Design a protein around this nucleic acid. Structure first.
Ligand SMILES: [K+]
Ligand SMILES: [K+]
Ligand SMILES: [K+]
Ligand SMILES: [Mg+2]
Ligand SMILES: [Mg+2]
Ligand SMILES: [Mg+2]
Ligand SMILES: [Mg+2]
Ligand SMILES: [Mg+2]
Ligand SMILES: [Mg+2]
Ligand SMILES: [Mg+2]
Ligand SMILES: [Mg+2]
Lengths: 48, 175, 122, 205, 175, 110
RNA sequence: GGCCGCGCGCCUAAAGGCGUGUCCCUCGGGGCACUGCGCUGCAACGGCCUGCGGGCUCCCCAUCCGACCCGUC
RNA sequence: UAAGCAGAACUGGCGAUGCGGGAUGAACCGGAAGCCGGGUUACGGUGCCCAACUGCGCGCUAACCUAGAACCCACAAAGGGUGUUGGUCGA
RNA sequence: CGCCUCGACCCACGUUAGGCCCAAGGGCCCGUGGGCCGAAGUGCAGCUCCCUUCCCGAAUCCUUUGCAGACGACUUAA
């Protein structure tokens, strides 16, 4: 059957959608996609 | 299937056997039980038969022990029945040894050893009890290396170990 | 267009038997499964086609040749070495030869094969 | 029937044009004896009797179902590899720990997935259709039966298999060039060491 | 050969009524002599009125093929019992011996009509010239230019030592 | 190729198939063994009387070694197809069926 | 697979074995035989012996085979 | 009418009896028995389950009805077929 | 996808009423001490005296909700 090949996310994700990745948003450091966003800054990251 | 005692002769052994009456031959302790005394046994156990494919100077593959697979030349069959073998010690590093008739395989390759003296080698020589042994080994190879050099490729053959490889059936191989 | 037929004069190889590897000539056909076969070294007998492999050789004879007539055709048609010089007949020959080799000859074949193999690579 | 005796790490069998129950019989003996068997191309296994007889046999099997709880009842697999897996299981004491271990040594695939596309695939002589079936009698392919009863990955199997055969055809062309080079090399190396290889002449094939 | 032809000779027991009774001979097909004599006494009881208890067995001799290297055409007239009734039929065979034809006849009756050996009576056997053969599949093998291919080869190893479970490629066979 | 491990091989590999059996009871006093390359009852006679070793790894050390050995010999053929009957000093564990055994040539008639 | 009760009072020979006389048998070489008293548990070699060694009828577990709950009418 | 029904004659069996085969089963087939080692058989089998040939040989069958496939035994009939294969007697 | 307390040697498709063949019954081996033409992956010398295995940052609970609910669970907020 069908299989997920890969996924690419945008550089800016609102905190409304980033809350979906947490059971307790206000107790966390809110680190989701913080390092993924760094690919859009460098040049090797943009190559990926 | 010969009948040795086929005839009631018994006199071809003792022809002059008409002889006279036999003369029959403190304990310090009595064992309290009638134990029949143990005397030495007067039975001759008919020494072992050599395999008809093993003849002096034939080559043997060793099947077990620390020298398993060593291709070795056969010299003599000892009184106990163990075969006498040498490597020789120069080519494959196998010294003079006595091996059981089992644990060896007699190949069809032969070497002449007629002018080689193997007399002082016998069961007493191997009694569990070395410089002179190095001399005897040294003086028995140089009498045998040349005859090995006489046949082409026999030196590299004796210096290699036998092994079975993929698809090898020991019950079909000629050796 | 088939290549090999059974008819009078076809030379066949006996497979699957005590007589395996021997050459026989089809001299008569009994029925759909059996044929009369005659050879230089055996008395004529019927054989199952299930135990016969037809070769590419075919000799000239009549239905029931005498033994002398059969020998002559097997010479006028040079069959023994035509079988042996073909690759098919050669394969049976060296299969016997390889099995017959003893330990010393097999060690020398190994020495030659290693020499031959290293030369191809070079 | 006893085992192969070949004592390898795993044997890969190309299942194309084998009879289903004769292939499963031999494989089951191999697994029970301790061999790992990988069967590929289970979509091209053959069963005697054409599509019609084989299709209604499955439909009768599809009828069987626990009346009070069907998810407990017989499980009817539709893929060719799971069909062959269940045929083999029927020939194994699978409710014992020995048969449980035996069936865990079997891998069955549709098509030839990696890494077996680059390994050697054998055949079973006494399961091949060309030696087992008269040329006029009916038969069907496992993938055709599976497609008729619910299998839906026949197209992706076919598309993948065409891609694999293209790559193998290119690797075959390259291997033929290297073989012609090899024959020239053994010809030139034959004279350069002509004297040494005299003992190899009578066993040359 | 499975079946043998025997000539069985016997008579009624010499009694003061006759004291030189008539001699009866039969040619019977059986697997050994004991089964040939039993079948002889079966027919003597049913055809004549002499049974084994009132009779004498004189001779029993096996008949052999004159030329077991040629191919003859063999006609057989037989009587057999089916599930409902008795019927007689004529069969033709090609063999190097009449023994093979009788084995062929018994095998064919077992296959085509499910008739076992006890329910068969060989009325008559003979050799037929190829000009006078009646059944098809015997005349079609009278072609002197007979030619055909082998449409079923039975690919197999020769001596069961070369048997392997796996092979690297599919067999190539042609005719 | 540069490989490691054993340098020579003076044994053939056998696989344990099970026990002397009928449809309804089994006998541990003899094991059934398939030897590689032996395909007929006739060529089994070469191996009759040959010594056999079953090698397995235990859980503790015994002589600074973690491997144990059980010795047996080939006794007779079993069937027409090369399978043989083997007698070991102790009966083989049923867990050993499907595993490998080493068939030597130590008692040699040739 | 289970068992371990000829040899010497003549010589030579590792040892198996050979070596005397008599009558007969033929076709080269044997055969049947002299019969007198005694004594009369087959061997060779190896590893190990206080140790992570050997054994076990004891305990637990695994596997293969076999196995339905006793008493009663 | 029949019945795994009801009643007699001769013998065997089960009951009182395990063991091998008939998938299973008081009675069918084999065979009866102290605790064991080795060899061989009976009945029944040799594709897998399952120990033993995918053994050697000749025919017949094609089941679009769940073709068919082990005494007791686990059913089938009268009647049909230009399915196919053997025969017999005729124009 | 995000977030971090015992030499284990060997890749043709396809067909058998056809493609020299007639089974790997072969061959090989000192055998001797950046694209993955994405189905994705472990990818392309003795005496050791005659056998003893050949040892290789979050989550959860207390709080909240009522789009949920017998209790757990669930959708929310903190
Ligand atoms: K009661
Ligand atoms: K009809
Ligand atoms: K993750
Ligand atoms: Mg079996
Ligand atoms: Mg569904
Ligand atoms: Mg009672
Ligand atoms: Mg009772
Ligand atoms: Mg017994
Ligand atoms: Mg068959
Ligand atoms: Mg039944
Ligand atoms: Mg009718």
């Amino acid at each position: 059957g069908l299989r997920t090949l890969n996924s690419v996310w945008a550089q800016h994700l609102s905190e409304d959608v980033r809350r979906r990745f947490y059971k307790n948003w206000c107790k966390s450091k809110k680190k989701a996609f913080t390092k993924y966003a760094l690919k859009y800054d460098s040049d090797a990251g943009k190559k990926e | 299937h010969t009948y040795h005692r086929r005839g009631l002769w018994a006199i071809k052994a003792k022809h002059g056997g008409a002889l006279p009456k036999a003369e029959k031959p403190e304990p310090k302790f009595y064992p309290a039980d009638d134990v029949k005394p143990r005397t030495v046994s007067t039975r001759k156990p008919h020494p072992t038969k050599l395999r008809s494919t093993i003849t002096p100077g034939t080559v043997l593959i060793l099947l077990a022990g620390r020298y398993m697979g060593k291709r070795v030349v056969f010299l003599k069959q000892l009184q106990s029945g163990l075969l006498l073998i040498t490597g020789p010690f120069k080519i494959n590093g196998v010294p003079i040894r006595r091996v059981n008739q089992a644990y060896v395989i007699a190949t069809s390759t032969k070497v002449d050893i007629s002018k080689v003296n193997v007399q002082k080698f016998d069961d007493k020589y191997f009694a569990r009890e070395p410089d002179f042994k190095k001399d005897d080994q040294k003086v028995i190879d140089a009498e045998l290396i040349k005859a090995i050099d006489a046949v082409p490729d026999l030196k590299n053959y004796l210096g290699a170990r036998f092994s079975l490889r993929d698809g090898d059936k020991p019950h079909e191989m000629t050796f | 267009p088939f290549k090999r037929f059974v008819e009078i004069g076809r030379v066949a190889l006996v497979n699957y038997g005590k007589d395996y590897g021997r050459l026989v000539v089809i001299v008569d056909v009994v029925d759909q499964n059996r044929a009369l076969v005659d050879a230089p070294d055996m008395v004529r007998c019927q054989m199952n086609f299930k135990r016969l492999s037809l070769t590419d050789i075919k000799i000239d004879i009549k239905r029931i040749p005498k033994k002398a007539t059969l020998i002559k055709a097997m010479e006028e048609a040079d069959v023994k070495t035509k079988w042996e010089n073909s690759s098919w007949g050669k394969k049976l020959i060296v299969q016997k030869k390889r099995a017959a080799l003893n330990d010393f000859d097999r060690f020398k074949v190994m020495l030659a094969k290693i020499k031959r193999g290293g030369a191809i690579r070079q | 029937v006893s085992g192969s005796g070949v004592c390898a790490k795993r044997v890969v069998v190309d299942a194309r044009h084998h009879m289903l129950g004769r292939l499963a019989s031999i494989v089951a003996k191999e697994l029970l004896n301790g061999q790992r068997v990988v069967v590929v191309r289970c979509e091209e296994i053959c069963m005697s009797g054409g599509l019609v007889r084989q299709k209604m046999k499955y439909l009768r099997f599809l009828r069987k179902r626990m009346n009070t709880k069907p998810s407990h009842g017989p499980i009817h697999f539709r893929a060719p590899a799971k069909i062959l897996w269940r045929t083999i299981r029927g020939m194994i004491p699978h409710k014992t720990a020995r048969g449980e271990a035996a069936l865990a040594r079997l891998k069955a695939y549709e098509g030839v997935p990696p890494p077996y596309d680059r390994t050697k695939r054998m055949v079973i002589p006494d399961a091949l259709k060309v030696l087992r079936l008269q040329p006029g009698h009916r038969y069907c392919l496992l993938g055709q039966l599976s497609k008729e009863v619910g299998w839906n990955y026949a197209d992706t199997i076919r598309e993948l298999e065409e891609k694999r055969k293209e790559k193998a055809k290119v690797s075959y062309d390259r291997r033929k060039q290297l073989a012609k080079l090899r024959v020239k090399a053994e010809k030139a190396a034959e004279e350069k060491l002509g004297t040494q290889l005299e003992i190899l002449a009578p066993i040359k094939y | 050969h499975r079946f043998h032809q025997y000539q069985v000779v016997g008579r009624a027991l010499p009694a003061p009524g006759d004291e030189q009774p008539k001699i009866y001979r039969m040619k019977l097909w059986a697997t050994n002599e004991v089964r040939a004599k039993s079948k002889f006494w079966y027919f003597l009881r049913k055809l004549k009125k002499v049974k084994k208890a009132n009779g004498q067995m004189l001779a029993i001799n096996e008949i052999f093929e004159k030329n077991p290297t040629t191919i003859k055409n063999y006609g057989i007239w037989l009587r057999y019992q089916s599930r409902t009734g008795y019927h007689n039929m004529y069969k033709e065979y090609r063999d190097t011996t009449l023994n093979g034809g009788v084995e062929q006849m018994y095998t064919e009756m077992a296959s085509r009509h499910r008739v076992r050996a006890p329910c068969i009576q060989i009325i008559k056997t003979a050799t037929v010239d190829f000009k006078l053969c009646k059944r098809d599949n015997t005349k079609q093998f009278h072609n002197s230019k007979i030619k055909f291919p082998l449409v079923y080869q039975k690919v197999r190893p020769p001596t069961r030592k070369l048997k392997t479970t796996y092979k690297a490629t599919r067999p190539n066979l042609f005719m | 190729k540069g490989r490691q491990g054993q340098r020579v091989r003076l044994y053939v590999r056998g696989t344990i198939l099970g026990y002397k059996r009928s449809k309804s009871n089994q006998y541990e006093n003899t094991s059934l063994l398939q030897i590689e390359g032996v395909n007929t009852k006739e060529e089994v006679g070469w191996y009759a009387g040959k010594r056999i070793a079953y090698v397995y790894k235990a859980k503790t050390k015994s002589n600074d070694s973690t491997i144990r050995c059980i010795w047996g010999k080939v006794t007779r053929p079993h069937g027409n197809s090369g399978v043989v009957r083997a007698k070991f000093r102790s009966n083989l564990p049923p867990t050993s069926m499907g595993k490998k055994v080493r068939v030597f040539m130590y008692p040699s008639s040739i």
